[PDB]
């Protein structure tokens, strides 16, 4: 069962990791029933002439 | 006879609970490795019912 837990936080820092402490809340639980070996995060590119 | 249903005979390893197996590869029991020619010690996993 693939579980995804989401949380949005309005930070305001220049870089690195922000400090503080918070919790985590569920969004959806999808019962796909298959195992996952590898994953890749896809970004986007901005195109102009 | 009903030949529309098949069953898997053997497997090399085990499976997780709540998992569906759809691999129809050539099963290898012992030596003389198969590589898709189905020769000696190469049995098909899916077999027909009776």
- Assess B5–A contact: CB distance below 8 Å, yes or no: no
Experimental method: cryo-EM
**Selected residues 17-46 of chain B with any CB under 8 Å from a CB in chain A:** 18-20
**Selected residues 2-41 of chain A with any CB under 8 Å from a CB in chain B:** 31, 33-35
**CA B4 – CA A19 distance, rounded (Å):** 61
With beta carbons less than 8 A apart as the criterion, state whether A4 and A27 touch. Answer: yes
With beta carbons less than 8 A apart as the criterion, state whether B9 and B27 touch. Answer: yes
Resolution in A: 3.1
- Find all residues with CB under 8 Å of A19, minimum gap 6, and list them: none
């Amino acid at each position: 069962y693939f579980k995804i837990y989401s949380k949005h936080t309005p930070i305001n820092l220049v870089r690195d990791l922000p400090q503080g402490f918070s919790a985590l809340e569920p969004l959806v639980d999808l019962p796909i029933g298959i195992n996952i070996t590898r994953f890749q995060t896809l970004l986007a590119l901005h195109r102009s002439y | 006879g009903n030949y529309n249903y098949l069953y898997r005979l053997f497997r090399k390893s085990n499976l997780k609970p709540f998992e569906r197996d759809i691999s129809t590869e050539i099963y290898q029991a012992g030596s003389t490795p198969c590589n898709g020619v189905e020769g000696f010690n190469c049995y098909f996993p899916l077999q027909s019912y009776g």
